[PDB]
Curated annotation (Swiss-Prot):
Protein name: ATP-dependent translocase ABCB1
Tissue: Expressed in small intestine. Expressed in liver, kidney and brain.
Gene: ABCB1
UniProt binding sites for ATP 1: G372, N373, S374, G375, C376, G377, K378, S379
ABC transmembrane type-1 domain residues: 15-302, 595-884
Domain of life where this protein originates: Eukaryota
């Protein structure tokens, strides 16, 4: 795939013409230098002696002409190329969505929905970035390179050879530097990936860590990793700065050598100095445009893969052509389905066969139904019924004709399908119903909604035919949604209607009306029903028993019952923070002996450019002086050597300039992370529960932060320093040497700087705000791709595609306008730069002709100002992006400055010696901070005495774990008092309490460490001797299990407990909890899924240690209730049953009912 631009042959006119324009623009610059060379000679000749006004004026005319030529050529290239890119991208996006909507259902099953959606959303943008702007830039760069070498050879015979001989050395050195930088970057990536794995492991189990209060250990480990992270980061920054310095040094060495040799030759009577100027400038500019081209080829290579994938999808041909119009289109469709030996297997799992052959004939006006055990395949049966799939081995026909023979669209349009969980499109209810059929009028909608028995629901909500189905728009009830879907199906005027789990839950009266309407449609429409309610099959015209992919039962309900088949058995069983640089300089603490050196080096570097202008103007002036003794040679030689120094110093300072800055930033990282992380732990778990603080989000903020803030502070300061130094020094020194020309160039500078920044951003940031419009239009794509099943079911694909086309045409013209605007901007910038030469040198000719200054002086001012503006633009655009960095810095400032309500880091809390162990919850009422309105506690109460075996029971999911979580003060209680030993719980030491108690989660978490260390992790603040760990393990009865394993406890835990089985993992967790010997123990489903003997051993250990050790127990096994000292049952946030197990059993009810159900 190298030629994938494959649309709008006429648009190819833009492709070539723009390219052509690029060529000339690329060639424009060396030509401009050519004349400049000759131009200089004129001055050098004229000063060596007058009619300079006319010659200067005609050269300025040449410059203006070439400038206008560029003003046309650059605009043409950029505009035309972006036009072609935009048009092709629009066409390919339309075709891509069209192809996706045409794919087969099984293909969607295999291919991830989110991957495909993000593919559409991002790869098209990648292709857009891979053509238009970048291609124009590449062609212009290559043209500039070629033309520069051509000019060098033509006007230069020996100097060009030496320059082009030096160039490959520069190329090799730069490539080596880039490779070294990439290697260092990858090594640092891995080095920090270590610490990042550690951070992920600690954060993902924040509940356990905060419960055990192991904050210190985790923080110490993270600091340990951060040390190596910082070391390698410092190495990387040093290497990057040294590479920059080496590039500078090589460039200035080339300058020195070229001017040395050219001065030698010209002193030897060779071509004039102007010839040297033109040849050197042109050759170097070409030999650096060659490298300037590379980003474009990188972008094109990137886009090649996206194009490959997208075209591979597009060219895919599906067997079930949902769009093919060649299929038969029967009209007199008498209701009749006939499946013969129908065998099927899901394409995702071809090995597993669901249907093992099936025969079934259903005649017109028949109510057929399917019944079977779990996995009976009824759902797959109906799916294959609508022709969504094809029969693996068998045949299916409608009205006596094979299903395949008929057109897929025609067959689909005559089949109503209602799933077990319909969802409506996020739009108006009228639109949702209209999606059933296009040619449907509001009267038809009224009739359908009346039939579905929902007119009251529609007329109750405001905007009957206008209520949207978006966020809070689609708040309709499940029954209301089912009614809406039924109405949609009815509006389809289908022949065959299939339904499954029609009206699960909710009032049956709505189910009654739904069934009545379905029966009324049954008068003429064949029906298939997958319903669990007995009444559904009570009047069913026929019921078929699908078990193990075999249809056995055949007959009415009475007939099947008389055979005592599975039907009878089933029936019986039924029975944007604000930031600021002043407030953001938190690194000054570790920056005082660093920022001073940084600013010093930056000042030196900035002044370096005006020094180069001084030397350049002096060298040129060494030949405009008429004295012309032999000393000129020496003079030139001397100046040449200065370049080398002007080069060498540049490297040295840079080596220091990075070392103070690169290190500084790195240092800041080692603080900021160690601060950020340190702040994260000292926080309330509620904050973690929020979706904003997802583990991935926290690790991204804690990892993709160093470079951000480092840039925002250090790089901003350094770039600003260098910019101000360079430009201010240039302006001042220009004013000293000449006034009028300095004023004119000062007037022109801002245009040059704007042009430089825009050119630098041309190849980087072409698509920034387009993503907004793309997302705005992509709601349709997300709808269709996510909900594709219903879309294909009711054949609404065409309307969705047309809607997408409109939504995409909304920004299409905007994209074309953006293309034209960018082209005009770039072209005007280039032309303004070219006119700068003409204006400045014409004014200089005027000045010199009146002895206002020496040509050396005007050249000095011109070079100083122009090159200063261009270099300041370049260095400003080379820095890492600031706005994103400032935003990230502000975000992390918010994170670090955040102070928790439960200051676990705070040591303020009553710490009485020992504890009585009486836990009292009175009118305890609280709700999750995520959903405070929904109550989790309803004034529940619980009184527990010292060493009292308390058991908690209730409906699964009632909020049992909520009480345990509150015991750790993870979430504050809205109402009621929680007291330990008759004391204010909140008034106690939060850390002291969290250490005193002990809790085993319903799903204990184990860190990747040695078993001994993991067990000892339970009790922090003091190393637990191996004897204590062994005793605890024996108490939990796992010591033998660990000793059996190789290396004993010394085994390294596999990822996610890979090495150890969950059964042993739960026992290990129990041992860890018991190690601390907590005053109060909390076990939540401690039995879980394990051997009953393991639960017996754990209970025996707890009972042995139970005395003087209060316990709270939750589980779904009744055995735990037998030995409970006291029992309690939670009911809707209120404890209903209180007392002993025997007393509760005698008072038959919730406890007795639960025991009977389970037992
Ligand atoms: C205003 C446009 C521009 O100036 C165009 C280039 C990139 N930037 C400016 C900064 C810049 C350039 N060179 C610098 C040296 C030190 C400090 C800064 C620079 C610029 C150049 O050569 O000067 C005219 C340049 C830079 C590069 C550059 C090209 C380039 O213009 C010639 N390449 C894209 C890379 C580079 O790694 C590469 O792979 O070349 C194919 C390249 O090495 C070479 C020459 O091979 C080089 C040169 C320093 C090596 C290591 C770091 N990478 C990052 C990008 C790359 C550079 C010029 C913006
Ligand atoms: C309309 C935007 C723009 O085209 C962007 C630049 C500046 N001007 C256009 C004219 C221009 C540029 N170069 C010219 C040479 C002679 C005459 C005119 C030019 C421009 C370029 O090279 O486009 C390919 C450019 C030029 C430079 C340029 C950047 C640049 O844009 C790519 N650099 C700022 C300097 C430069 O010397 C420097 O930054 O180091 C001190 C730079 O060398 C390095 C290390 O990049 C370089 C270009 C290779 C080298 C030798 C002479 N110095 C003086 C100015 C500087 C240049 C391009 C306006
Ligand atoms: N794309 C798929 N690929 C493979 N198996 C699938 C796929 N979709 C579903 N299955 C499973 O394959 C089996 C096919 O049975 P099917 O679900 O059609 O019948 P069912 O008894 O009506 O199902 P259910 O219990 O979901 O109501 C089920 O276990 C189903 O969960
Ligand atoms: N992060 C959370 N934020 C808010 N509510 C939550 C969160 N996690 C779970 N819940 C809700 O809290 C209740 C959890 O019940 P809890 O675990 O406390 O008791 P349980 O009887 O052991 O039940 P289960 O183990 O099924 O959750 C459920 O309502 C669940 O929806
Ligand atoms: Mg099913
Ligand atoms: Mg629970």
């Amino acid at each position: 795939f190298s030629m994938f631009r494959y649309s709008n042959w006429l648009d190819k006119l833009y492709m070539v013409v723009g390219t052509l324009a690029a060529i000339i623009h690329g060639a424009g610059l060396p030509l401009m230098m050519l004349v400049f060379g000759e131009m200089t000679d004129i001055f050098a000749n004229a000063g060596n002696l007058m009619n300079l006004e006319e010659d200067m004026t005609r050269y300025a005319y040449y410059y203006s002409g070439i400038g206008a030529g560029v003003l046309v050529a650059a605009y043409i290239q950029v505009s035309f190329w972006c036009l072609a890119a935009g048009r092709q991208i629009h066409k390919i996006r339309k075709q891509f969505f069209h192809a996706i909507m045409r794919q087969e259902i099984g293909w969607f099953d295999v291919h991830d929905v989110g991957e495909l959606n993000t593919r559409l959303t991002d790869d098209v943008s990648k292709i857009n970035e891979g053509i238009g702007d970048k291609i124009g830039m590449f062609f212009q760069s290559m043209a500039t390179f070629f033309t520069g070498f051509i000019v060098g050879f033509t006007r230069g015979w020996k100097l060009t050879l030496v320059i082009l001989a030096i160039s490959p050395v520069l190329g090799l050195s730069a490539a080596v530097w880039a490779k070294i930088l990439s290697s260092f970057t990858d090594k640092e990536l891995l080095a920090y990936a270590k610490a990042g794995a550690v951070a992920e492991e600690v954060l993902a189990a924040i509940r356990t860590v905060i419960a055990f209060g192991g904050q210190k250990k985790e923080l110490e480990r993270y600091n340990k990793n951060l040390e190596e992270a910082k070391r390698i980061g410092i190495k990387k920054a040093i290497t990057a700065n040294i590479s920059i310095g080496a590039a500078f040094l090589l460039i200035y060495a080339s300058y020195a050598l070229a001017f040395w040799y050219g001065t030698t030759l010209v002193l030897s009577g060779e071509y004039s100095i102007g010839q040297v100027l033109t040849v050197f400038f042109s050759v170097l500019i070409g030999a650096f445009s060659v490298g300037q081209a590379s980003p474009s080829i990188e972008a094109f290579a990137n886009a090649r893969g996206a194009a490959y994938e997208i075209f591979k999808i597009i060219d895919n041909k599906p067997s079930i052509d949902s769009y093919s119009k060649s299929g038969h289109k029967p009209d007199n469709i008498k209701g009749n389905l006939e499946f013969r030996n129908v065998h099927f297997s899901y394409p995702s799992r071809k090995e597993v066969k669901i249907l093992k052959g099936l025969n079934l004939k259903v005649q017109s006006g028949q109510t057929v139904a399917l019944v079977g055990n779990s996995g009976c395949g009824k759902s797959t049966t109906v799916q294959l019924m609508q022709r969504l799939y094809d029969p693996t081995e068998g045949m299916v026909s409608v009205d006596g004709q094979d299903i395949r023979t008929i057109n897929v669209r025609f067959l689909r349009e005559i089949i109503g399908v209602v799933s077990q969980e319909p969802v409506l499109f996020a739009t108006t209810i009228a639109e949702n119903i209209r999606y059933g059929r296009e040619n449907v009028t509001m009267d038809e909608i009224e009739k359908a909604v009346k039939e579905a028995n929902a007119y009251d629901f529609i007329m109750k909500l405001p905007h009957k035919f206008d209520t949207l189905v978006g966020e809070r728009g689609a708040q309709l009830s499940g029954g209301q949604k089912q009614r809406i879907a039924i109405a949609r199906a009815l509006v389809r005027n289908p022949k065959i209607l299939l339904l499954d789990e029609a009206t699960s839950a909710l009032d049956t009266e709505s189910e009654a009306v739904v069934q009545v309407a379905l029966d009324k449609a049954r008068k003429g429409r064949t029906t298939i029903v997958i319903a669990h309610r007995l009444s559904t099959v009570r009047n069913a015209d026929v019921i078929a028993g699908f078990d193990d992919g075999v249809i056995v039962e055949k007959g009415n309900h009475d007939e099947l019952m008389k055979e005592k088949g599975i039907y009878f058995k089933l029936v019986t069983m039924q029975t944007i923070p604000p930031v600021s640089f002043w407030r953001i300089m938190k690194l000054n603490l570790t920056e005082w002996p660093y920022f001073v050196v940084g600013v010093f080096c930056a000042i030196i570097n900035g002044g370096l450019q005006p020094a180069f202008a001084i030397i350049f103007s002096k060298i040129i002036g060494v030949f405009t002086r008429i004295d012309d003794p032999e000393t000129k040679r020496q003079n030139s030689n001397l100046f040449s050597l200065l370049f080398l120094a002007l080069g060498i110093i540049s490297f040295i300072t840079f080596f220091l300039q990075g070392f103070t800055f690169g290190k500084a930033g790195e240092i800041l990282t080692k603080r900021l992370r160690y601060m950020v992380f340190r702040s994260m732990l000292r926080q309330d778990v509620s904050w973690f529960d929020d979706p904003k603080n997802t583990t991935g989000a926290l690790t991204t903020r804690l990892a993709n932060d160093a470079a951000q803030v480092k840039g925002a502070i250090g790089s901003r300061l350094a770039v600003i320093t260098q910019n101000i130094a360079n430009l201010g020094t240039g302006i001042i020194i220009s004013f000293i040497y000449g006034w009028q020309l300095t004023l004119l160039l000062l007037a022109i500078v801002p245009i040059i700087a704007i042009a430089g920044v825009v050119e630098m951003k041309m190849l980087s940031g072409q698509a920034l705000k387009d993503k907004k419009e793309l997302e705005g239009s992509g709601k349709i794509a997300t709808e269709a791709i996510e909900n594709f099943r219903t879309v294909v079911s009711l054949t609404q694909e065409q309307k969705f595609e047309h809607m997408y086309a409109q939504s995409l045409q909304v920004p299409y013209r905007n994209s074309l306008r953006k293309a034209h605007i960018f082209g005009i901007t770039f072209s005007f910038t280039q032309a303004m730069m070219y006119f700068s030469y003409a204006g400045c040198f014409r004014f200089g000719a005027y000045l010199v002709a009146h002895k206002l200054m020496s040509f050396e002086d005007v050249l000095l001012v011109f070079s100083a100002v122009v090159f200063g503006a261009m270099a300041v633009g370049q260095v400003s655009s080379f820095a890492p992006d600031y706005a994103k960095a400032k935003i990230s810095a502000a975000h992390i400032i918010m994170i670090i400055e955040k102070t928790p309500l439960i200051d676990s880091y705070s040591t303020e809390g009553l710490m009485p010696n020992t504890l009585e162990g009486n836990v009292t919850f009175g009118e305890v009422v609280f709700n999750y901070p995520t959903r405070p309105d929904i109550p989790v506690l309803q004034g529940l109460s619980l009184e527990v005495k010292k060493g009292q075996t308390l058991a908690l029971v209730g409906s699964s999911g009632c909020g049992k774990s909520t009480v345990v979580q509150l015991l750790e003060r993870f979430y504050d209680p809205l109402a009621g008092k929680v007291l330990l030993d008759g004391k204010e719980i909140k008034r106690l030491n939060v850390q002291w309490l969290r250490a005193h108690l002990g809790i085993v989660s319903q799903e204990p978490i184990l860190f990747d460490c040695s078993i001994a260390e993991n067990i000892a992790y339970g009790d922090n603040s003091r190393v637990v001797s191996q004897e204590e760990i062994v005793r605890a393990a024996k108490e939990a009865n796992i010591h033998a299990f660990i000793e059996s394993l190789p290396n004993k406890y010394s085994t390294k835990v596999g990822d996610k407990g890979t090495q150890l089985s969950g059964g042993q993992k739960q026992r290990i967790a129990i041992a860890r909890a018991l190690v601390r010997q907590p005053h109060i123990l909390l076990l939540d489903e401690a039995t879980s899924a394990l051997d009953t003997e393991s639960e017996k051993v754990v209970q025996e250990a707890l009972d042995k240690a139970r005395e003087g050790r209060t316990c709270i127990v939750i589980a779904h096994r009744l055995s735990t209730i037998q030995n409970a000292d006291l029992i309690v049952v939670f009911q809707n946030g209120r404890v209903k049953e209180h007392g002993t197990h025997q007393q509760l059993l005698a008072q038959k009810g919730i406890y007795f009912s639960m025991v009977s159900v389970q037992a």
